[PDB]
Write a structure and sequence with these properties.
homodimer, binds sodium ion, DNA replication (chains A, B), Primosome_PriB/ssb (chains A, B), OB fold (Dihydrolipoamide Acetyltransferase, E2P), Replication restart protein PriB (chains A, B), NA-bd_OB-fold (chains A, B), about 55% strand, globular, mainly beta, 5-stranded mixed beta barrel, 6 strands, 1 helix
């Protein structure tokens, strides 16, 4: 079991990159702000995220500030790192009807 | 939305501590090892976890090596920290029938 579901806004969206094996790869910087319940609290969390393959292609050029629901697994950012990165398995924009 | 579900083993279990407001607090160090789907692999993740209140009392003196399913929210360890901490909302040992 390793699944993080997070509501987040796009702070940064990288240019299209690739894995050493030639698969599309895209890095995003995400910010989450919410109030949660702990022992009967607000949280602000900044987190790096990476999408590979088709999802990287879909998330290409996501405007900055876009609000999203995402899901994936957590992993250390680099070998031996304290920094974690969210490996995206799902991402959807919070579509609205304003929208002006 | 901010929920991480993780299967993990206890590498460290702290002594009973307290919040500044006097609530029970307990820190654990958890290791996760699994293989996941990345579209498309192996993930090994070490993460600090903190339980407050009644869950802290329940998790007191968890033997090192105990395997668990945990759930909670992610938050930075401190301002501008790259270290994240799982704020435990649920924890259960993986009970088995072996013995010994
Ligand atoms: Na897993
Ligand atoms: Na790779
Ligand atoms: Na939330």
């Amino acid at each position: 079991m390793n699944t993080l579901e997070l509501s987040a806004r796009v702070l940064e969206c990288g240019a299209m990159r690739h894995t050493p094996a030639g698969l599309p790869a895209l890095e995003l910087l995400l910010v989450h702000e919410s109030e949660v319940v702990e022992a009967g609290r607000r949280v602000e969390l900044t987190i790096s995220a990476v999408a590979l393959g088709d999802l990287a292609l879909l998330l290409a050029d996501t405007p900055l500030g876009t609000e999203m629901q995402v899901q994936g697994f957590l992993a250390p950012a680099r070998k031996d790192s304290v920094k974690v990165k969210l490996h995206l398995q799902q991402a959807r924009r919070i579509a609205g009807s304003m929208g002006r």
